[PDB]
Amino acid sequence: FVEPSRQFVKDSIRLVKRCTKPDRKEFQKIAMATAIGFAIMGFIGFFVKLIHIPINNIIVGG
């Protein structure tokens, strides 16, 4: 009842080494390019900031 624990813990340490472990180049590309892609979806919150609270002032005030 104890050995499938041994199986999975050795099974993990198998496939950790088989993976390719990226280096300073691809990390760089998806890093900067996808923080940029994040902020593409990101400033949208600053525009519901700029809009939907002042029009909620329009909502409640009238």
């Binding site: 999975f8 099974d11 993990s12 198998r14 496939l15 950790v16 088989r18 993976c19 390719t20 472990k21 990226p22 691809e26 990390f27 998806i30 890093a31 390019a33 996808t34 923080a35 892609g37 994040f38 902020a39 979806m41 990101g42 400033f43 949208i44 919150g45 600053f46 525009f47 519901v48 900031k49 809009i51 939907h52 909620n56 909502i59």
Partner: protein, 426 residues
């Protein structure tokens, strides 16, 4: 079970995509219009019952969708998500049979709509439970049906990420972004109008003298967001993209062509667990929905195995809650990997029949030994691929460097896989 209710329930379906098949950028137009909608959809409701606590599952619930006692975001896409997930369960798990005629897949979408709308009605009833109860229900379904149509017009339509997952991602961008610039603060004992923004920690240098105690409030701010919190939030983003690039390479002689090597990869995140995290989230959302039925027939004694312990003090007053919460998180994501892969593709037979179906054969051995070539990767790269996300989200909670936590880690993981999907067609 399927043969009776599905033929009658066909009321008001969606229109399937046209014959304007190949395009680059009007695809992105159909995205952006939905993103205009969820500019708009997170906006204020019309009823003046101003209840004190905003939502009861507001934090975990907020992580999934953050318009708690708020807008037409309807406290979550939890209808469409939960109703999609258990539908794919009961299709994959053979409690209910599989429909593979196109009438059955169409009515499968119909029953998807059915359970989704019924769950919207359930959430509506369970949040509203005065005499002002009219027309809330009309609003919610109208705004449930809208999220339904926008999601199913971004699966057979544009759809690349989903309708769902990119909604979660952009709303998580916003929940970092309200923490990024923060205009208001209700005034405490000192210091109005500065709550965890960097502008806040740049206006704070303009007001107060004794800049040492201007640094201390900037870096160890507790009740509002913090900039040490923002450093940890950035740090988590960097590590998680360190772990997205964990992939297993498998080169492939294509069949019938001399030596082209388009190596099939297996990334560890392994659909980025948009099942498996939302598997971890929505079960702990459905009870904190149904604790409302526990008030009659609670936020106390049921919480000790329900939630994280929320405390930056690692030796906070209950180790039972901490241990069981972390062990449940790890085991839940691992177990829902090893159960998830069997339904939404990329299990052993799935990969084998896709590769034979696209004429790609492993070099080392015969074509239907490819299964045994890669069956010694996919379950572990499910299970570990489950496991060291949830423990990773442990590091999203253990250290408060997360704007919203676990969910933000994982919706930006959605974005990161999303970039790959968009790039694919270049």
């Amino acid at each position: 079970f399927l043969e009776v209710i599905k033929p009658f329930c066909v009321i008001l379906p969606e229109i399937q995509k046209p014959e304007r098949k190949i395009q680059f950028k009007e695809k992105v137009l159909w995205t952006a219009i939905t993103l205009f909608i969820f500019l708009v959809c997170c906006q204020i409701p019309l009823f003046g019952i101003m209840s004190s606590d905003s939502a009861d599952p507001f934090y975990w619930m907020r992580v999934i969708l953050a318009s708690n006692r708020g807008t037409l975001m309807e406290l979550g896409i939890s209808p469409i998500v939960t109703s999609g997930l258990i539908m794919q369960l009961l299709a994959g798990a053979k409690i209910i049979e599989v429909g593979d005629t196109p009438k059955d897949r169409a009515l499968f979408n119909g029953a998807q709509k059915l359970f989704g709308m019924i769950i919207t009605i359930g959430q509506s009833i369970v949040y509203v439970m005065s005499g002002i109860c009219l027309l809330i229900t009309i609003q919610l379904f109208v705004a449930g049906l809208i999220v339904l149509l926008l999601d199913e017009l971004l699966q057979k339509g544009y759809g690349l990420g989903s309708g769902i997952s990119l909604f979660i991602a952009t709303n998580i961008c916003e929940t970092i972004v309200w923490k990024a610039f923060s205009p208001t603060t209700v005034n405490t004992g000192r210091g109005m109008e500065f709550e965890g923004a960097i502008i806040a920690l740049f206006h704070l240098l303009a007001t107060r003298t004794d800049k040492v105690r201007a640094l201390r409030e900037a870096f160890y701010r507790q009740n509002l967001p913090n900039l040490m919190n923002l450093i940890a939030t950035i740090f988590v983003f960097a590590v998680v993209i360190y772990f997205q690039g964990f992939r297993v390479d498998l080169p492939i002689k294509s069949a019938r062509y001399r030596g082209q090597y388009n190596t099939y990869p297996i990334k560890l995140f392994y659909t980025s667990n948009i099942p498996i995290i939302l598997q971890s989230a929505l079960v702990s959302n459905l009870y904190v929905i149904s604790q409302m039925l526990s008030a009659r027939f609670p936020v106390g004694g049921l919480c000790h195995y329900l939630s994280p312990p929320e405390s930056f003090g690692s030796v906070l007053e209950d180790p039972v809650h901490a241990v069981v919460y972390i062990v449940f998180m790890l085991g839940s994501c691992a177990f829902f990997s090893k159960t998830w892969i069997e339904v939404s593709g990329s299990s052993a037979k799935d990969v084998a029949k896709q590769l034979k179906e696209q004429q790609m054969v492993m070099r080392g051995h015969r074509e239907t030994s490819m299964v045994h070539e890669l069956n010694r990767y996919i379950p572990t790269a499910a299970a570990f691929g489950g496991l060291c996300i949830g423990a990773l989200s442990v590091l999203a909670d253990f250290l408060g460097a997360i704007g919203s936590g676990t969910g933000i880690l994982l919706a930006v993981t959605i974005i990161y896989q999303y970039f790959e999907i968009f790039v694919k067609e270049q």
